[PDB]
Design an enzyme around this catalytic site. Structure first.
Site: not given
Ligand SMILES: CN(c1ccc2ccccc2c1)S(=O)(=O)c1ccc2[nH]c(=O)c(=O)[nH]c2c1
Ligand SMILES: CN(c1ccc2ccccc2c1)S(=O)(=O)c1ccc2[nH]c(=O)c(=O)[nH]c2c1
Ligand SMILES: CN(c1ccc2ccccc2c1)S(=O)(=O)c1ccc2[nH]c(=O)c(=O)[nH]c2c1
Ligand SMILES: CN(c1ccc2ccccc2c1)S(=O)(=O)c1ccc2[nH]c(=O)c(=O)[nH]c2c1
Ligand SMILES: [N+]
Ligand SMILES: [N+]
Ligand SMILES: [N+]
Ligand SMILES: [N+]
Lengths: 396, 396, 396, 396
Positions: D120, D396
């Protein structure tokens, strides 16, 4: 202690012995489904004079052998002796009874997967395929300039949910199994069980995903405990292109450190990389075991290498017959004879040569295979070799 | 940054770079001995305009290839670039200069052992032998009824001090290397070093012992830290009898839990046991790497399988020539041609086929080897195969 | 149980206690050399009424503090109580006697390295520097576009034998220690010991090598057991250029997987890479401990940040005095007063603030430092901060 | 391969890619809730000409920065490229499109948590907070005489069920986040998810418990496999008293050997103990990453240290503008200029300085930050420093 075909009332006792004997026991409902693959009188049980203290059965299978020939095959499984009844020769008794029934039913070969390597040799089974675990450290993996599917445009591989592409997997596998030595027809009840296991288990295995090409697929899941390891449960590719494309996608699992797969010794994956060493052989073991039930039928049924010229010899199988064996034009003629033996081996050794996974030279060096003529050895080596590498279809 | 043959004054700087580059560096006195295997103008160094920042050399070796034919072979070793001078193309420059000298000197092939699997492919080297580690849990190991040397009377194997039977080891090895693809003549200075390493080291390796048969020997030592593990440094057997006898003695090491050895994929040891699985493959890696310096000389020098019939084709080696290749009666004829290629491969791929360790089919499946005719593939497979299994002599 | 300065006859008994107390005991001959750093009456022993059951001494050191000011420093070491005489207050007695002698001799500060973190707080010592272990996975390490010394031409770093460039290391270190808070003059006998430890030990440490730049050096060795780990024993760089050049060379150790170093929290190495995360903090611990012997002398001797404006306050050290502290133009004035305290802290806390390794805010949050005014806290924070990051010179 | 805002029909394909890409994927129902934090046109997807092969979105967040100022912040998340479509620049395309939308929407900063540290930086994000894991061996932990809340009477901390005190946690956190750099408003849907995760999972995490003080709380659970380890998922304390009280209760978990927490480098816990070393730093990593979208708006919005005097300079951000920066009275004025730059840095570096987690001196030593004047460096160091230590709110 009597030996009978089980009645409906015997099966709850068989399931108990199964649960106690097998840590990966699929459970009563799955077990009740697999029963559909067992022919009438395909099962034996031993009762104590009455709970079940011994059991064994065979399933009706179709084994592909070199020359893309498909043999009816008795697949031994669900073998167990209660821990209360060891060293009573219950296994010897059960195996003998089933071999009688298998032979009389007209199966040319029987097959099994062995829990231990020391048991099944004495009953005429030889290990006939080899399992190879490759673990790839995918963070260093770069494909070779020569590797297929490294051009511009789009990828032909899709990431999909297994349950939504059963038909496409069935079709690819069906093509695969018909052209590969070791291939088995996978019946409907085994597809049901495969896609059940692709589902996430509360406190168990994680969700499985699929990589799908027109001519290949891969099912994979992240490991329970090692979250940087992806486990490829199954990869089936019909063209080299499909195989390379699928591996490009798997190396593209950028969140994993390592990809593991159980494959075969001739898997070309190492040669797709600039560093062959990145595809480490972590594990190696006997796969499918084969017992030749009818020597002449089996030897006559498979194809042989066209490269070796026509030659004739006399093969004696220990307590299994003596035959004039004539091989040429990649076919064999195998007929009774009392002429002096030129080649000698136990029945198990023959099982091990049959799919071309072991060289006759190698077994001869261990003296599992006797002959006073080394030209004959070279000739057997070349004739019994398979041009398509021998693979293992699935455990049963 | 200049590239020269080293003078006597350069060697202390080369030894420094060696010490810094190689954790198993044999040290200055041992290194001074190995120098005797390097021909005049067999070494290059790179100085900084002056301490040594790069070095490479070759040794004069004699490699046995299929058909028990012995080739003069340039063995690359003592290759190092200072950590201060990475990514300056010093290796490319040194390898190019040595390949010029090797070619002009009339070596048909060059060989090395690779520190990493990703480096030497681009310089035309292909991995040509495979190392197999077997670890035996000797507490369960029972020999098969069929295994040689399981009769009454005495044993023909003796437990001895290595240093007191050098002559017998030399003689056995000399017989071994002349009849096995991958065999290397071991010169006197390497025997001196082998029996030096058999001695116990204060805070290092333990004392080595020998098992001696008329037609074979084994050198073994208990591991430094794992005192229930015996490490077989070297086992050389000329007859199957010798090989079985030596393994009976090694399984007789009743104070050990496990015996480990680095061997080859066709080692018959698993087949000497009632449980093949007891001889576990713990590790597997490329052994000797081969660069074909002169394609026609090399292809014409080795023998081919008598089993395959006479056939002709056109082989193109990338930036290496195009040849009419005619193979029959286990000999090859290889002559210049401008006729259209039927077979295409990089020089490294040829190295990998040359001793019969890799199947052409397998490299074709990875697209390292191109042809539109699969009958030709089968024919190459069979022709290039070695009836004596290819082995690895020693690291250099 | 009496407490005396040791006679010549006491030292063999002290060496015995040393051997029994310290697993890294340098041994009698090395110990006899280090004795030259102990002033007359710099040692105490406790005899049992007679073998030695307790000992402690200080060495004459020169500690650099912020503002590049060099303080005479009593360095406590060789502290041991026999396991037969625990809980007899022998340490309290020995520390008290030495602190009396140190104070009366006119040392403004004393210093030690602590075997455990729970012991020396009660005797007025506070941890004043922080050790940071970084382990780099050098196989992924790529330098940033912005990093110095990534241009064409040659490298200014040389790989050398430590023993042949003592003078250059001495000179670089001497420059280093004079400009860094935590710097210590390294006397001749400690250089003798450093280059003795750079030598390979039979069944011990491996040979050390050096990377030498005009304005920096690094000493490193491969680890005893982990042969893919290089341990940087010492890296001293006077310019950012030297520091980057040395790290380019260390990342150039292509046979290693990981490079480890014990450094300081503000080491810029992470920021030289495209992936800061590759330089993992594996370990973190208190380094040098400081006891302020004379509060006004110490506070007046060091420089303070020019950025903060002039301010005045009253500092009370528990059982250590109360002072009017006036700070401005990066100098301090510290004079006796009976005016009400504005700031309160134990002597140890002051030790911890003195070299700028701990923020006053942080100690205040733990209530080790009391004040009812938070503006004063911010002012102390800024004033006591060091613009040159505080480092640890060497263990004593 | 097109780039669009997703329609309702795209989300099942996004969830599939999520499941395949993220091992900690919260699942479709939780994911459907988090969607409420994504503004209209806050998401991009890439379809293959159609299943989803790429996705990215931002959430509307409120980030506290030094001076207790709260910035609207675009929080990047749910970023994934299918393993079938690596190295097609899909991430570069998606990031560019979202940065366009974020900038045009008027966000001064964007933020993310990075899966890897190497990705990033090139898109202008710099790591701006540091995570510190402390593991305490609580069996030796004794509080210091000076530590708050070690008096007679009762404890103000209660052991409670998390789900029954949501309101009190919400209120404490709301106070916390408004006064700490790195603080984020936690919306209702994230509280729902936090207290869902506090529940015991069949074959998963154990039941969580809470320690509740008027001015602080801690959520903890015993580890799945290590049953002598308590994992503090979250500790939020508004006063030093609350922080000490909570740690007295946690050290009171007499059935545990070790307490672990992910905290910040300035956590005072070590200083509450008689042995600072008992609070071991086991792990350290980048937390929140920051991209300054609008340099002048961001620099003008935060407060600066009052201690440093008024000063002026010219800052050039690479491909990001050049500004006259004037700082005094803990405010900044940042206006366009073509005057010669005094300070130079990439946009990412600015992100890393912005919350005061990295010293300008340190980045300058790595040459990520250029200036020919070291007085300016000291001034930036002091000005950009935060008197309240920077912390990380939640992933997040
Ligand atoms: C925590 N989560 C979120 C985070 C933001 C979201 C916004 C809209 C809808 C669903 C959303 C879900 S999530 O879906 O498990 C999630 C997301 C990104 C990730 N990126 C990574 O690198 C990793 O290791 N784990 C992650 C887990
Ligand atoms: C896979 N399974 C089958 C296999 C064939 C069956 C045929 C009819 C009815 C049920 C059947 C169940 S099964 O019941 O879990 C099963 C069976 C034998 C096993 N033998 C072993 O040594 C072992 O480790 N695990 C085994 C698991
Ligand atoms: C075995 N050795 C030889 C080999 C050939 C020599 C020829 C002339 C003079 C000295 C010689 C020493 S040596 O010096 O310890 C040696 C050499 C190269 C190596 N390359 C590696 O990658 C490695 O891991 N270890 C190595 C060890
Ligand atoms: C480094 N050494 C010194 C240090 C100072 C000396 C002064 C005069 C004479 C000998 C001296 C030897 S030493 O003797 O091995 C030494 C000393 C104290 C130690 N304290 C510890 O807690 C520990 O773990 N290892 C120690 C090692
Ligand atoms: N075949
Ligand atoms: N051969
Ligand atoms: N300083
Ligand atoms: N702040």
């Amino acid at each position: 202690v009597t030996l009978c075909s089980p009645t409906e009332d015997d099966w709850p006792g068989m399931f108990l012995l199964a649960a106690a004997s097998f840590t990966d026991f699929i459970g009563p409902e799955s077990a009740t489904a697999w029963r559909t693959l067992v022919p009438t009188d395909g099962a034996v049980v031993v009762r104590d004079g009455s709970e079940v203290v011994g059991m064994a059965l065979y399933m009706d299978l179709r084994l592909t052998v070199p020359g893309e020939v498909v043999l009816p095959t008795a697949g031994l499984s669900f073998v167990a002796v209660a821990p209360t009844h060891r060293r009573r020769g219950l296994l010897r008794a059960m195996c003998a009874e089933l071999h009688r029934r298998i032979a009389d039913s007209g199966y040319p070969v029987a097959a099994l997967h062995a829990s231990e390597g020391g048991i099944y040799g004495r009953f005429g089974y030889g290990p006939a395929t080899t399992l190879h675990e490759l673990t790839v450290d995918r963070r260093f993996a770069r494909f070779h300039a020569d590797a297929p599917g490294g051009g511009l445009g789009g990828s032909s591989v899709r990431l999909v949910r297994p349950t939504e592409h059963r038909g496409e997997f069935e079709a690819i596998y069906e093509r695969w199994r018909q052209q590969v030595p070791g291939g088995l027809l996978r019946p409907q009840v085994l597809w049901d069980e495969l896609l059940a296991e692709a589902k996430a288990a509360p406190g168990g295995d994680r969700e499985s995903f699929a990589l799908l090409h027109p001519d290949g697929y891969a099912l994979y899941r992240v490991d329970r405990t090692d979250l940087k390891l992806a486990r490829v449960s199954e990869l089936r590719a019909v063209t080299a292109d499909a195989h390379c494309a699928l591996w490009r996608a798997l190396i593209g699992l950028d969140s994993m450190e390592r990809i593991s797969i159980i494959t075969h010794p001739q898997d070309p994956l190492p040669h797709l990389l600039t560093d062959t060493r990145l595809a480490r052989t972590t594990w190696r073991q006997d796969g499918l075991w084969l017992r030749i039930m009818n020597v002449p039928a089996a030897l006559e049924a498979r194809g042989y290498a066209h490269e070796v010229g026509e030659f004739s010899t006399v093969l004696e199988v220990s307590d299994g017959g003596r035959f004039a064996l004539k091989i040429g034009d990649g076919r064999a003629r195998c007929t009774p004879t009392d002429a002096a033996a030129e080649i000698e081996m136990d029945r198990d050794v023959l099982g091990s040569l049959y799919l071309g996974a072991h060289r006759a030279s190698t077994l001869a060096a261990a003296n599992r295979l006797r002959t006073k003529d080394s030209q004959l050895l070279r000739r057997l080596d070349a004739a019994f070799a398979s041009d398509v590498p021998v693979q293992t279809a699935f455990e049963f």
